[PDB]
From TrEMBL, chain A:
Record-stated family: Belongs to the universal ribosomal protein uL2 family.
GO molecular function, one term: structural constituent of ribosome
Keyword vocabulary terms for this entry: Metal-binding, Ribonucleoprotein, Ribosomal protein, RNA-binding, rRNA-binding
Xref: NCBIfam families: rplB_bact
Domain Large ribosomal subunit protein uL2 C-terminal: 122-250
PROSITE patterns xrefs: RIBOSOMAL_L2
Record-given protein name: Large ribosomal subunit protein uL2
Protein's UniProt keywords contain 4Fe-4S: no
Gene Ontology cellular-component terms listed: large ribosomal subunit
UniProtKB/TrEMBL annotation, chain B:
Start and end residues of each Ribosomal protein L9 domain: 12-39
Family: Belongs to the bacterial ribosomal protein bL9 family.
Described purpose of this protein according to its UniProt entry: Binds to the 23S rRNA.
Transmembrane annotation, as ranges: none
Keywords assigned: Coiled coil, Ribonucleoprotein, Ribosomal protein, RNA-binding, rRNA-binding
Organism of origin: Pseudomonas aeruginosa
GO biological process: translation
Protein name per Swiss-Prot or TrEMBL: Large ribosomal subunit protein bL9
A GO CC term assigned to this protein in UniProt: ribosome
TrEMBL record, chain C:
Gene from which this protein is expressed: rpmB
Family indicated by similarity: Belongs to the bacterial ribosomal protein bL28 family.
Recorded superkingdom: Bacteria
Biological source species: Pseudomonas aeruginosa
Protein name: Large ribosomal subunit protein bL28
GO terms (BP aspect): translation
Gene Ontology CC, one term: cytosolic large ribosomal subunit
HAMAP family in UniProt: Ribosomal_bL28 (MF_00373)
Pfam families: Ribosomal_L28
Listed InterPro entries: Ribosomal_bL28 (IPR026569), Ribosomal_bL28/bL31-like_sf (IPR034704), Ribosomal_bL28_bact-type (IPR001383), Ribosomal_bL28_sf (IPR037147)
Protein keywords: Ribonucleoprotein, Ribosomal protein
Gene Ontology molecular-function annotations: structural constituent of ribosome
Amino acid sequence: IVKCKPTSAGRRFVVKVVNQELHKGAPYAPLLEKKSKSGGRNNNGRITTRHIGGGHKQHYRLVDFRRNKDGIPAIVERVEYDPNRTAHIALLKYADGERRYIIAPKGVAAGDQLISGIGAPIKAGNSMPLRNIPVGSTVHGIELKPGKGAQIARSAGASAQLVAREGAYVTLRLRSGEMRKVLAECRATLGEVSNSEHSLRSLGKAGATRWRGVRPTVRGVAMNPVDHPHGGGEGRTSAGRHPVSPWGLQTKGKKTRSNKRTDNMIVRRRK
Amino acid sequence: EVILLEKVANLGNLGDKVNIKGGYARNFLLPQGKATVATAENVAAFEARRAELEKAAAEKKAAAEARAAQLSELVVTLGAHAGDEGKLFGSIGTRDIAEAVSAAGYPLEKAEVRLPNGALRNTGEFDVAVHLHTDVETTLKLIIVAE
Amino acid sequence: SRVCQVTGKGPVTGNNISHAHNKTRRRFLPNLQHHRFWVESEKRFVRLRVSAKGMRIIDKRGIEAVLADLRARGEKF
RNA sequence: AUUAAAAACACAGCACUCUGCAAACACGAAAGUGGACGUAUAGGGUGUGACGCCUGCCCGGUGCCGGAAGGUUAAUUGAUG
RNA sequence: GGCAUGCUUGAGGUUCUAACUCUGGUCCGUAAUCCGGAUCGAGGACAGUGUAUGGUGGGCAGUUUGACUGGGGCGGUCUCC
């Protein structure tokens, strides 16, 4: 993590994250495919999600989440950059070829973990079911329906903690603060996700956000009464309604969960 | 409403007619063959098979007497992990336990089970709720040893 | 469309009268759910979306009197 | 676009809050699609606008959040006269 | 008074699977995983959907907001002795 010298008006506050562990140039080619840019537009053609557009060409990488190979020792080749994600991914190699990308744990550059219904059991990077692990451990990549794949604790530097165990349900405390009960045969992976040098970065200039795929936002007090309920005014007005979405939704604190189907699996709400 | 044909439920009889909820007869009894709606059309045929109904009531309990001598033997030795450590590390099983109670027990296996007490804690003999009835069940004894 | 495969119920229209008689339009939709019905002759479930008034008529004739005249007006079950 | 190029709008940066995945949210009579083939170091919304030193008191009014003890309170039942 | 147990019935609590549910897994139609069908896995009388009813609801719509007046706006005045 380096600082930049103020040579220009853009370079004054750029904070980079450089890494020399990353493999310089190539992706492995059969694990790579085409991805198109949406613009934030559904099949009616209209903008649903605002402030998206532009950017750069990207290839989607088929990152493996199931880890269904069992009893095979896998050996890491190298750690690569992945553009549609905040973590680093690793290239694996099993005992008989069959290379494959996974989310990289804290271990890097040819360790050899073992992916099984239980084996070699404890490292960073061993996948094994959630009943055969000690309490108080830190895991990541947690399935919720068995066979479906990792859904929770998957972004950069993220993890969860085991707390309790009884019956079919193995309770864990999420990164947010919510404590879920999770069914016990869903697999998970010991350790933490690789790139934690990511909350320490600053873009510096206005055109740095724009070549990543985020389009300018405009405030609601600088519009007309026809466009946004904060509306127009004379001079700078305090927008004399209570603060509200452009569709009429209260925004400074209003509980909006209404699922009413998964409420049994939650122990404690996030506070 | 319907005419009963089974005797091993909690209200069943030989040929008594009962009045039950519409969802309990539509969904459960009739698509298996344990009851029949009361009619006035084939009633000359139901009276002819009353001798065949009581011979069927002297055979369903006869096969059960030659069956209970193989269920409570408790000779099933499940090969789970966690030999001599103390911490839960064994393969408990929710789909592989139905094949274990069918290779040396009753051959029926279908587990649509509502359970928050599925997996078991540290190494020892505990109980797994298995498919035993259709509107109740109790838990079956499981032996967990080393591998 | 929201029709039944036994009784032939369709959506109708009407009003939505207030307490000062401000007429405005709504639709009356028939109750109708998916459900599976066992037959004995073809020994298989058939699934067809019927009303709750279609569930009562199936409780009257039983399955096959209502299945046959559904075929005898030329439909897929 | 064709009388207004600004002190206006943007902005990197800052804070608040909602969202545990079939997510909040949006477009759709509905099927479904965006979000996102992403998973809280993420995604929506509202204000202020690099940097430096800082951000005081008031919870009565209005809104949101929390709590149920007690009061009133909807069709639905229909005693009694 | 209650004693018992029954007969029915409300309200609450737990559990079970067979209804419904699965934007789960693998077979089949199929050279497609959209859609079905078969089987296991999860939830489970909840969710969800009709119809009757409460609440919130400028998100949206149809509309109303008088006259005399030494210009009309402000103020004063509209009936009876």
